[PDB]
Design a protein around this ligand. Sequence first.
Ligand SMILES: [Zn+2]
Lengths: 650, 388, 75
Amino acid sequence: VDKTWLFGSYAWQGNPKALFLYMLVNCKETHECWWVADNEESMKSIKKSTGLKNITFTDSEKAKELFPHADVYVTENFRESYPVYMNENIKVFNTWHGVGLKHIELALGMNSVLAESIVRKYVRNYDIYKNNVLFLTTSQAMEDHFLEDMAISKELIIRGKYPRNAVYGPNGIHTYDINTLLPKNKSQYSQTILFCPTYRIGAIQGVLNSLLPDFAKLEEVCRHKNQLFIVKVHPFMKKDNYFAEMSEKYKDSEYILFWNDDYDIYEAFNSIDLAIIDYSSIFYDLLDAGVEKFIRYVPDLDEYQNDLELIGDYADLTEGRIVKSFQQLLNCLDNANIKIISTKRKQYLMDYFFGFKKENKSMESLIADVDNCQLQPKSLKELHTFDIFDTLIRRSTLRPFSIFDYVRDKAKASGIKFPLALTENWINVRNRAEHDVRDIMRKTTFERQSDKIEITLDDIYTRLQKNLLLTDEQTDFLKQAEIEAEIAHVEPIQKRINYLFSLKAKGHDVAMASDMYLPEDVIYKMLDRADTRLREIPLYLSSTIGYQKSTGKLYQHIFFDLDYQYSRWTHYGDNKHADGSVPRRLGIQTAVHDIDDFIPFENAMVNAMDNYNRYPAYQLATKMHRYRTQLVQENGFGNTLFETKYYNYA
Amino acid sequence: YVGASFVPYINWAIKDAIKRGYETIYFISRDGHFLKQIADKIIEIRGYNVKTKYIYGSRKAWRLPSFITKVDDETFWQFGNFVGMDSFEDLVKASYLSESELLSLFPEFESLRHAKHLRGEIAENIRKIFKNSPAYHEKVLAIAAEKRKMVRQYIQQEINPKEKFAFVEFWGRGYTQDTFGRLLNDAFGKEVKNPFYYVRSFTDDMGTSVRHNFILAPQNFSFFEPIFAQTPYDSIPDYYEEKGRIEPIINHRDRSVSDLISEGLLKFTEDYLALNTQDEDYFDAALSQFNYQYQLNTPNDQFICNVFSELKDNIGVEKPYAPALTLKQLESITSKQELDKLTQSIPISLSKSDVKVIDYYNKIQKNYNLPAYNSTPMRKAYAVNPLE
Amino acid sequence: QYVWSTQVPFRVLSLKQNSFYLDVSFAETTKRKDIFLKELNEIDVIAVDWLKGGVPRLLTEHGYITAHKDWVKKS
Ligand SMILES: [Zn+2]
């Protein structure tokens, strides 16, 4: 053998499985084909059900042997993880899991319920996606749609047929005998009907209950007509207890069969005489498998089409007699001869969706287009985002509350009379007001019709002024004092700034992502006072955007705002959660360092002071911290020398 | 305890209202009984120039009529009327329609009988389908315009609009105030500024609703609802008319608890306005900060355990707020829902329960996914033994 | 017992099989399990980040590694 192909997916299904079987049969001499399951039990199940021996599992020593020098990796999805030992030049043949007219992948955007998973996938594996994925397209319309919705290379497209819709034909491949699953042989029914409902938005009754409320009358009708009614629901619909109830009720039913999902229904497409479909892509699959009788059981047409935004018109790009009521569905099943799709109509739909099928395509043609493909990759840039406070810059008094102390110390001395509660208790007053505004934002997402929950300095001081009945003079004095103090206490963390600029000089993209309420111009003034160069670096400030790193939303906003083209994303920060856990959940490499902090003597010194003496104590404690920092991690002194010097000093 | 909780706040509010120029302060039903008693005592002693009046009302008596030209989308939100449904009766009641009047609109709803719990995504879909029906909107609007007659007349007869007035509550989101401001505008036919005094509220000023907050911190004061539920009559369900005059429906309760509570509160008002303070506003702020932080984070306190948590609260029958727990009661739970049914404060209830009960709760919590108990049993401090 | 330099970057040899950590804490949850620094391989150290307690961590393009002299060695 010369070439090596592995096939992977989360289940024994799809074009991966179809092509795997077809190659182990009709390509035993030119290719060595293996199927990598996700775990051991999956391999055991496949081997027990099929008897094949070319089945391994992920991270197996056989897999660690095959992946490093394989030739193709076939998949039905943009996998969430790829083997770290996968060869550099492998060809990821992504034979998608269906065609249709619904948006997918990057097109789902930041509002999608699946945003975090998409961001994780792409941040992790963008290099692979862009330089090693050969995406299978079936028509020019579908090719354009997929290229719009995904980040695939137009040069690596593969045009052809869906292996799962053309391999299990009458004389084709079958891993199981269909008659072993049916109460009677297929020939002993007048007609085989396949019910393929999708999962809906939401309804009081389960999808199956809304679509099939009375299974008893359905069985009566199907017995009258000697029809085999095969119920195949979306996996999410099976969680309903009504599904299990009606499944166990009709376990031995001769005319109602709840399809067992351990068997690939695609293998049985050639045995389906009628298909009751709604909004599932499988319809098109059926159309590609030769099925010609269709019933569109779409009672909730105006709750799905009016809701979702599609690329085309459902009624125009689908087929089947329209039906919107259970009673009319039964009337049709009893007294109706559903006619085959008109030749012109089938030509229309088949062009639109599987046009490239007319180019004399074949399985071997697909394998040839794959093998003869050439990877011409491009080296991609990396992304390096940086937290600001206590990462790129720090405070000359270390602790944030020192600032407030400073501000308080100015108020009481300005000559402007303030309320005692405000002066003496400024720390608690202001910090608790900030947290109050934050809770207000979090609790007013409906009233504001927005999920952004970040506050601004103006919000904090508005709360304070409107509920402490303060004059504009007092409020402006305090706010400007805080701003000027934050600016005047800035110090650079020079090593990380210089590392950021070395990265930028290497050609990488760098940016700043900070959670802070201060306005953007104040942040830029602080940065400029730390290092002027920093004024030229992109900035993602939460106050400006409304999303935060703590919730991970600011990272999603960065991903969808930039023309994300990076092979790696690294974020440098001090927060074990905002700058660590959360970004890691989004597939981002994190470098989380420790924040500056006092030790027992310095802390006790600061905690022992009242209002008059707390700020100079912050100054002296921070000088002690700077001294021990310099001694240990600048001068490189030993333990005894450092301890002697620090004692003698402090 | 209750004096520190209530009297400093009402002193702050009265002084702030005198400062803002308010001539009249209205105290709203239930929460305003004890608070108006306190305010009257403060005004008597300090000789302040400000009138106090009492107004009967509630969320139930004010929400439906407030739908002047539209049904609030909040009705279909996470904190709307369809939140907390447990049975079909709950759904029909939260719908404002009759059972048959409801099933006429939504025959699909006929399948909702005996639901066990009408919460979760089921309730989400229910709220959606309610929001999607214009017929429902217009029928609710008709019912609201009919029930609004008596409420408008009550407002017109009880509230002098030509004055500079304010309202004094204790805690809330601020949505009740918004509906009441809509009713005010409809009753006086103009943009009527209604300011509410709270201890705290979450929402900002919206429209004519103004909100003056005592404490500016993210604390939740629903904690003190048990006390106000000792007011000697139920929440006002609606109004009625007699002698050509509008009156609130008042179904009374026993007066013992509220009698003693008012005794204590007025003793505290006298003893609190008698303190030699250098700055009274700052002592208000300081005693309030300390007292709230104490009562909100001290579940093993003697008196928060033996008195407060024992107060009956319908929330719906007269059951304690956070009673002690027995071993078999915990043997009967498997979720946090079943335990919330037993108490409104797991920490306080556990601090009152036997050591074996606490140990059993610890044994079962990690699995049943119950909150972690991070307190110790309550130790009495004074009258530490039975005095009999 | 700690290998580090004030002058970054600098090359280090992995004496033993060294793991990568995405947090100076070296907590189990932050340890990468997809890849490690192979024994007898060299790697550039681009930063030295110190815990609050005064312990250095050597940052590489793949994450943090230890500075303990039994596990890394200046080239
Ligand atoms: Zn930071």
